[PDB]
Structures are given as C-alpha cells and as structure tokens.
C-alpha cells in the first residue's frame, strides 16, 4: 500500500501516538507488549496459586489489593463453585459486562480468551472501553482484532491480554512473557463501539472498519513509518 499521513497527538514513555489522517478515524503507536492477565479467572489465588504471582495484584491479606474486587474486610473475593476457578480470586478489568455482578469473574474480560489491549490511564486519546483495534506484530507477521479492555499506568504503554499475545506469537506467560522490543503496532478506532457487546459482534465491527480503512496491507506499510 501507500504510506499514511500521520499527526502526533500524544506521547507516553517515549512512544509517539499518531492520529492517522483520514477516515475512518484512528490512531496508531508502535510499542512493546507486556502481558495483562487481569480478568483471567486463574490469574490470582492464595499462596501464589495463580498464573501470576499473587503480590502482582497487591496485598491479599487485607491491604491494598488492586487485582479485583474485595469483601467488606478488604480481602479479595474468592470464586464460587459456579465460577471458572473456585477458590481463586476474582480478577477485574476496567471494561466489564453489566449483565454480571461486581463480585463475579463473568463481569470481567477474560484475558485468557479475549484479545484485548490496554491503554494508559489519562491517554485514551478519545477511545472508550469496548472500542476496537487492529494489532500487528511486525516480527512475526501475525495480527488480531482486539478491544480496548483495560486501563494501565499513565506512564507505561504497550500491553495486552494473554490471548492477544498468543494471536501475535508473543510469549503469553504472565510471569515472564511479553516483550520489551517495540514490535507491536496497535491501530485503535476511537468511537467505534464504546460499550460491552458479544465478541462476535465487536470482531465483525473491527473487520468492517479495517476493510474500510484499507486492511492489514495498509497497516503493514504504516508500520515501516513508525
């Protein structure tokens, strides 16, 4: 394809975020890819039983716990017999399905099964949780549609779900996976969805926007500009 016209709109951690001039509206950045296991129902459990170390969700003994919802005494909610991993903690994502209660793993986006990206807090650049994106790994040639599913630290950029890592052929392990190399190009369509909907529906919408925008071929050429 031809090169795209790019206009800087933001910068986080040395990564420039560009509006892609034209329609449909989109922005793009090239960054590393840290693993966000948030929302996976096996991410966190007592005594380091999860796929991540427990302390990466905070203090599970009544202290500051950010991994997910807590009970009235500040301890993480444990999954029930009707939840995917009974006795593990409920891990939360910023994006959620309103059909389920705050204490339910089903309210959150399962990182193991759903391709999702993280955007830095205070750096959404017009995107709303549930909006779609096209994600491309320039070193493997792999790609995947994804939703904006979680919010990261305001000072960090380039992170996504276990399943997105799998789709991109990046090591998906929450404890040692991901990459610091700036090899992932993320094209976000702000204003595209802005709510929870079934993955079949948002994936189809991502496909329609990507076709209108010029397809992976255009993003491949654009990656050489970043």
Numbering used by the authors: -1 to 224
From the paper:
We focus on AMGs that potentially encode chitosanase enzymes that metabolize chitin – a common carbon polymer.
Two V-Csn constructs harboring either a D148N substitution or a E157Q substitution were generated, and the activities of the respective mutant enzymes measured. Both constructs eluted with gel-filtration chromatography retention times identical to native V-Csn, and circular dichroism spectra indicated both constructs were folded. The two mutant V-Csn proteins were crystallized under the same conditions as the wild-type protein, and their structures were determined by molecular replacement to high resolution. Structural data from Cel45 and CaCel45 suggest that this acidic residue is the catalytic proton donor in the GH45 enzymes, and given the structural similarity of the DPBB domains in the GH45 and GH75 enzymes, it is highly likely that E157 is the catalytic proton donor in V-Csn.
